[PDB]
């Protein structure tokens, strides 16, 4: 009864991700006054899997230069993690419960960024290093303030653990309390999954395709699979921890129903940010993060800190 | 109230081409269930509709027949298919419908249009189309 | 006359209530916004595709497209081998021969066009001097074979019987003009 | 036989997945190439086939030469070709690309890209306007609808 | 860009190359309710520049 | 036990994926289509030769900003205690610090990257 | 122009321009795709008299 | 129009969907009709372990109440 219970998470998951890749192409498409697919299936809604066969079926490519150990187990370890970082999201109720959740989730993110790293090392190519050291200068963008910001939220919270902010937020949306939060929060996660104006590890522009550019066929579909995942993730977990979804004890369906109306809505501004903007040069956003949300961040840490004890409103530890 | 306008329309255009047999057959060939006025018909069987509220573009269409010079084109339809007295108004080089200004007729028109015959076996093939120049020697055909 | 598209530096000073706009646009990403704002708009645009191919793309009556060889009413060839829009053409794309027919005339026994190194630029149908070579509208006639791109006398008459019902049309529509 | 059937509708569903998603590797050459970018601008909306523009030629499955091909272009042009995965299409288009074109006595002028790579489809025209590469384009996936791979492999 | 080339199209029968200027002047007049088009297309480009 | 078992499964979807992408496409190997990829020319060197990092200074002063987190993640547990003004002076200053530490390289141009 | 009243007045607001007066497609103001014919005038030198090419 | 992508939109939320409540069913299917115990403290633990030992079938959510006194 829990394989079954697996089933009904990686399956729908892996179907929702299918069809972002449908919503994105539609939803830039009218952003950009054409349609977008509508011609494989009513609305286009089988062009997702004729792109998924289509890929599997392509001949998969072993460069006579690349590491083939390592670039085999990056695209494998990329879907691995961006799966695994479903098991304890609460919805409500969680797959896996853990206590300290929100650390799972910040070190399995940190992980997948190896497999950006090992796949570009791995090819053996100058593009593909040239993305796998944007992605390094990615992270060292990004990874200080987003866990920082994540400690400024959880001191309202009173633990690490996911299903305490369903409870947390039983009256009130920590969006409110926390809004300067959570605009700092919004732009980590574009850049934690590389999306525009963050895609500066693929960044077709500059480089021809970054990290993946060596990859084809099968192998480079479970990369972009690992990507539109973690977007749904990264907004569903935004809409956890500062939208929080009614939650009744006698009716958990209409969390899920709030909480996935949400989720998608999050998960459609990414589309809609990737149709409006330039994308920002690696360097500019390093300053981004480091000379603008980083000192306002540890000055919100502060805040924070302080708050709870000068209102007496220390959250419990249960 | 506009809203209920809009699904008016919606529903008058999900059951303005005859049954629901009708309406998947427009609707996964063309991917489109408009209303059009039927302009005309040829003698292929292809239908040209029009609706000058649509915007320069797609105001006039054609759909095509599902069977043409014995060929099955119920789901390979081409652009090749439309006639050439259509040809001008589907591309609106004119204004006016070949059903009330027919070409003018002549004796060598082809009366059966033929659509793009590549890799077909009535596909064209090139040739020289002149005759020999230089003429050889014949020997006699007896000892000497 | 000249303007500066760059040029503002007639500086004004920062009054509280301006500095606090300026932070506002700032910390706000007020423009940002509002560039999100346009993109959003599009979106209830209606979409300005057309569903090709039971929709086309307007052309118009002079549109320079596949090759074709006339008659004139009687179903004798307007081509006299006259050979000017071989002289013409800019690609060299027109190959020629010709001879007494067997009533006399002066007509071609060959006629070729490579469309590979035609370019299309209608000059041999300026130089004809009795409408024999024209450009037809049609333009969806990609081959599988570069071979079938080489159009001899016959594949060029054909097209003339194919499409005359047209051609007369557009000439009918246009000849004024020239 | 029944073995024969199912792979025949099998042959259709492979077909069908190569149709309905066509990679073209973003490369153009010349002005032919700005024409390939009307093709993707909103009026025709090549995207709405499932035709995306890849800049990779191992994400790419067609490749589109679309422009002329120089002598000195050439080798770069068949490299690229080369690292494309296999199934891969050509679609020469342009006079250009056809056979030379305009240029097709230019000692710096490879006359016709297929010399260098095998073509698939041959689009004519100086430029094809966007709906004739449009209309190429939908020709080779009737022309892939025609693959008998699977059928060929079981009477091997 | 689309419309533009239409302007070309109508007055060359080509959307891009259309070969119309020459020396001495132009190679044909201006169909008939070309200018209309050409106004109407340009009383609305100065949104469409505010809009980029 | 749950947690190893939906991970195996994940695991074992990525590694069956993989296996059949490998052995299901119709394969044609030559050198030229396993050389590397340069935008059409032969590669002029190997892709394992130095590649000077221009944020050297700021990659390391990740790290020591990064053990820095690894001090301020038990707060929500020092929140618990009785001695709060403790915890909180701790916290202002560890804090504070951080963000002293952080203004000096700022000025230094130690956050520019080196040209 | 099809759009309901309550689009439009979402879609003006979030551009900030009044887009209805405006619009990138075309409808029924374009020309009409068939013209009468034209009669197009000759040149200066159509003279019949006390026009030798060598003056010009 | 723009409506033409919520055909994928819904599809996209159905799914998003499943996964929340077929946990939290399933939760109740394995757990005799109450919420999966969770046991963040060792108390709580211990709490589920002496469950187990007092229900006479060896699982923790066979309640005994009044009746078993
Ligand atoms: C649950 C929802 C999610 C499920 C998605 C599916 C349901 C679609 C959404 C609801 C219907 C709305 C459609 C509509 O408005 O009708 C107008 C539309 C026609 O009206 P129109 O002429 O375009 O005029 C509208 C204006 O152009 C332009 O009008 P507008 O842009 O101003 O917007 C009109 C209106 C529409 O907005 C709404 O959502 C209501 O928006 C509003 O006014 C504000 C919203 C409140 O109706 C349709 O086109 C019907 C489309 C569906 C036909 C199905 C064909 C049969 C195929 C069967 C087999 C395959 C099926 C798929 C298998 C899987
Ligand atoms: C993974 C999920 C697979 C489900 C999708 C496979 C079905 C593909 C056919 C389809 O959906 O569209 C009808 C398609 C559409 O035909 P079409 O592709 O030629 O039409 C396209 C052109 N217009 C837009 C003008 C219509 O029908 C076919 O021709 C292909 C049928 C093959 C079915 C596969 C064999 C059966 C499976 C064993
Ligand atoms: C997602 C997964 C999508 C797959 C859906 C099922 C379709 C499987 C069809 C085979 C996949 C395509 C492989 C291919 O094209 O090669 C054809 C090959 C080529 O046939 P061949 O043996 O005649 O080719 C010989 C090599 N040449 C031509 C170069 C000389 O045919 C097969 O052997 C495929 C066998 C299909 C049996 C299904 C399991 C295969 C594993
Ligand atoms: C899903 C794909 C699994 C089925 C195909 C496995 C390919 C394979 O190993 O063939 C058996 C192998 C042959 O592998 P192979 O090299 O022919 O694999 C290629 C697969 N096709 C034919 C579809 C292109 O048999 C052996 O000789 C060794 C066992
Ligand atoms: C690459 C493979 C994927 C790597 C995944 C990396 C992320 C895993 C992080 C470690 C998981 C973790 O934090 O353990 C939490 C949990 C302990 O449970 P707890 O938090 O105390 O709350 C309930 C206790 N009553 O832990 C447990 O319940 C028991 C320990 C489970 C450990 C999971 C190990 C993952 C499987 C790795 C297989 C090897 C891969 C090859
Ligand atoms: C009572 C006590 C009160 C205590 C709390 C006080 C809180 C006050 C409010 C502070 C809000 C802080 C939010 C962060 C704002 C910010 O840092 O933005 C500035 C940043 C810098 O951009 P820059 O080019 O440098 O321009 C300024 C020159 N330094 O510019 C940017 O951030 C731009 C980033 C944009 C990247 C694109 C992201 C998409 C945006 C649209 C999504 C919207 C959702
Ligand atoms: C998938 C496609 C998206 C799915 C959702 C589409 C929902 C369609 C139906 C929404 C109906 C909204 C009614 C809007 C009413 C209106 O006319 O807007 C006017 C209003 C401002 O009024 P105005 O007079 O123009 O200016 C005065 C400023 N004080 O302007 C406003 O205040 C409107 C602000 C809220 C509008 C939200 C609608 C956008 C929905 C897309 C979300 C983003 C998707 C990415
Ligand atoms: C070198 C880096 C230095 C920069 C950082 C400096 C930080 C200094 C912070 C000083 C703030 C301490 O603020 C101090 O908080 C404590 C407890 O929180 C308050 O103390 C009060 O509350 C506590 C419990 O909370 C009671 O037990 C106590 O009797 C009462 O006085 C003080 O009234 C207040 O003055
Ligand atoms: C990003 C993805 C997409 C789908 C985009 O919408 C479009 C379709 C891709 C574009 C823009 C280019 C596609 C191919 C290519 C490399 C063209 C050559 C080119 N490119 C030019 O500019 C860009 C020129 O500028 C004067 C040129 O002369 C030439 C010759
Ligand atoms: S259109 Fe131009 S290039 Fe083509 S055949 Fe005529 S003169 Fe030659
Ligand atoms: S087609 Fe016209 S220009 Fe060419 S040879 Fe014949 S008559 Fe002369
Ligand atoms: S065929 Fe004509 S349009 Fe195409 S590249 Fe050559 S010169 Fe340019």
Redesign the pocket.
Known sequence: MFFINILTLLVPILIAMAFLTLVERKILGYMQLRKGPNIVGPYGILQPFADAMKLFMKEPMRPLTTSMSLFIIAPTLSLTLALSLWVPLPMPHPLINLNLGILFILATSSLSVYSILWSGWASNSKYSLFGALRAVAQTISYEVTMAIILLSVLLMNGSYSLQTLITTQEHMWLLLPAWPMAMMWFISTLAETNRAPFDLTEG??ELVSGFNVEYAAGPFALFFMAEYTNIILMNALTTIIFLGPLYYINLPELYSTNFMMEALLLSSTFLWIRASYPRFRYDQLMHLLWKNFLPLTLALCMWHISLPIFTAGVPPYM | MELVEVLKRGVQQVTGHGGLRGLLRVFFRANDIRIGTLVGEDKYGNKYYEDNKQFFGRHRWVIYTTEMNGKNTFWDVDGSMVPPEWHRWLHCMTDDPPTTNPPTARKFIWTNHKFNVSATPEQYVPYSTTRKKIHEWVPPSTPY | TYKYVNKKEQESEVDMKSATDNAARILMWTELIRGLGMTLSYLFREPATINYPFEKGPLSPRFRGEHALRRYPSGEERCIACKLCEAICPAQAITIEAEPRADGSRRTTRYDIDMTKCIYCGFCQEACPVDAIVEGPNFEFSTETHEELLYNKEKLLNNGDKWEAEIAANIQADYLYR | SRAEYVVTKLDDLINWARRSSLWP???????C??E??H???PRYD??RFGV??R?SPRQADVMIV??TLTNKMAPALRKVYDQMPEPRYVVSMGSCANGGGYYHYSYSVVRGCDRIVPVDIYVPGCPPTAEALLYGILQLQRKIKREQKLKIWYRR | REKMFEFYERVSGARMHAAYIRPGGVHQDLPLGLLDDIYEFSKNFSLRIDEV | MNLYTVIFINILLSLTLILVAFWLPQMNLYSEKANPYECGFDPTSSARLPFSMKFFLVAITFLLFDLEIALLLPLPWAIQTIKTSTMMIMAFILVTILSLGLAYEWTQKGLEWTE | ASATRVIQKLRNWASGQDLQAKLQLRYQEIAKRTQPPPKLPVGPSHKLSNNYYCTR | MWFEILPGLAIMGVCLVIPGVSTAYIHKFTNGGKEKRVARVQYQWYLMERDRRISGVNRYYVSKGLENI
């Open positions: 077709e522009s | 590797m973003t490369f153009g050459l010349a002005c190439a700005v390939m970018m093709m993707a601008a090549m995207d995306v523009f800049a679309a422009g």
